């Protein structure tokens, strides 16, 4: 299991205390909010830099 997870074949992680293998189901299927957040911060900081330079 460790070798498989190291090879990125398994999208999951191991709980050795309880002899357990927990997989990240990643059923959300999103990652659009990450792009939105990057777009939000980069351009708002871009706007702040432009306003400071223009004044």
């Amino acid at each position: 299991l460790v070798q498989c997870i190291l090879d990125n074949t398994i999208h999951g992680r191991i709980d050795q205390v309880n002899q357990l293998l927990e997989l990240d189901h990643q059923k959300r299927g999103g990652a659009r909010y990450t792009a939105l957040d990057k777009w939000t911060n980069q351009l708002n900081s871009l706007n702040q830099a432009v306003v400071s330079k223009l004044a």
């Binding site: 460790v2 070798q3 090879d7 990240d24 909010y33 957040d37 939000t40 702040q48």
Partner: protein, 412 residues
């Protein structure tokens, strides 16, 4: 700033593998950095430096050996330099050097470019043997002026690299490697030698990624390369740099595809086993053998500070790779994956979290390391609200700035 104590270094093999001024420098480094063995190292160094008519470094090594012998005469309670060596060596060296100079300057009156280049290369070799670095550099430069063919350019590059290695002018080494590689349309394997030189120069300049990449392309067919670096140390350097910089998939791909580092790891089975345990999550044995290689190569010509940084990076990467496949890992088990204690592992994990690239939380109650997987939305909303507050605050500030300018407000 350096110098440690460690036994079990094999002086004979390490001295015989290298040869030339490189061997002299390595023997001097081993003697100066390894006490309780400096006696035999200095004796062998003086025995070999007497060969090929050295002058000043011979005086330094003789003084060091005399001091060491005097030290030996007081602990269990100094050799003569045979100053006739000065006379005979100086006489013979002067005679042959002036004969060669006369021949070369007569050839300069004959005006042949290739002959002048070859004579200047011979003069540079003679000066390097005599212990004249700057003189050899000037001879090799007057040779570089009179180049005719691609092989002449290659020989010039090799000579300049060899000289600047001793001069520690690694910038010249890198420039000449680039010149010898990029120019002539990038059985006789010269590119392997050039890549070895570039890799060693980069490692001496505190570079690990590009140095490892250059070493990976070095084929074992080169075999004999004693003027710069022995194949065993080349394998050690490549393995250490790859372990420190290349992650698991990159490690596997490069080592397998190179097919020459397979042989190199065959020469050095310790590094091969360490890399295999790194891939197979056996970091305890990996790091104990790493400490063994530590004590073994702490007195290497160009390794010590670089290898210390490499080992720090190696242990950090080992911890990062070990915790990565787990969302809730017991710190007892993680500490048992090495000889470290619970407290030291906890401190190292805290330092890694502070630096980053582990993304973890330390539940010190049960000593379990929980990975951090935070929802993007909660972080996104928090920083978006902070941005809006900052935008409003900057909106106020710019709004304020228009006040002092429209109403002409300033210090009189």
């Amino acid at each position: 700033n350096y110098v440690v104590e460690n036994p079990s270094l094999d002086l004979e093999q390490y001295a015989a593998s290298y040869s030339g001024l490189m061997r002299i420098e390595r023997l001097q480094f081993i003697a100066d950095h390894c006490p309780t063995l400096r006696v035999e190292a200095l004796k062998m160094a003086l025995s070999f430096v007497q060969r090929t008519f050295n002058v000043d470094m011979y005086e330094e090594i003789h003084r060091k050996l005399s001091e060491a012998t005097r030290e030996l005469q007081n602990a269990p309670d100094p050799p003569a330099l045979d100053t006739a060596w000065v006379e005979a060596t100086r006489k013979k060296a002067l005679l042959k050097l002036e004969k060669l100079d006369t021949d070369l300057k007569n050839y300069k009156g004959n005006s042949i470019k290739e002959s002048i280049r070859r004579g200047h290369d011979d003069l540079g070799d003679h000066y390097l043997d005599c212990g004249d670095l700057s003189n050899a550099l000037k001879c090799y430069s007057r040779a570089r002026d009179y180049c005719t063919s691609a092989k002449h350019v290659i020989n010039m590059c090799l000579n300049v690299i060899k000289v600047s290695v001793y001069l520690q002018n690694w910038s010249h080494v890198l420039s000449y490697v680039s010149k010898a590689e990029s120019t002539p349309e990038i059985t006789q394997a010269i590119l392997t030698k050039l890549k070895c030189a570039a890799g060693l120069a980069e490692l001496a300049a505190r570079k690990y990624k590009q140095a490892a990449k250059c070493l990976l392309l070095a084929s074992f067919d080169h075999c004999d390369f004693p003027e710069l670096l022995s194949p065993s140390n080349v394998a050690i350097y490549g393995g250490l740099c790859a372990l420190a910089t290349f992650d698991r998939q990159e490690l596997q791909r490069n080592v397998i595809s190179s097919s020459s580092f397979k042989l190199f790891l065959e020469l050095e089975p310790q590094v091969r086993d360490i890399i295999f345990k790194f891939y197979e999550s056996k970091y305890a044995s990996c790091l104990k053998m790493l400490d063994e290689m530590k004590d073994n190569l702490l007195l290497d010509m160009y390794l010590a500070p670089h290898v210390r940084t490499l080992y720090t990076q190696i242990r950090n990467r080992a911890l990062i790779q070990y915790f990565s496949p787990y969302v809730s890992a017991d710190m007892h088990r993680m500490a048992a994956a090495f000889n470290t204690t619970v407290a030291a592992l906890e401190d190292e994990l805290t330092q890694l979290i502070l630096e980053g690239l582990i993304s973890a939380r330390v539940d010190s109650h049960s000593k379990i390391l929980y990975a951090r997987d935070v929802d993007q939305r909660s972080t996104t909303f928090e920083k978006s609200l902070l941005m809006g507050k900052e935008f409003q605050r900057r909106a106020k500030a710019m709004m304020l700035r228009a006040a002092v300018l429209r109403n002409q407000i300033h210090v009189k």
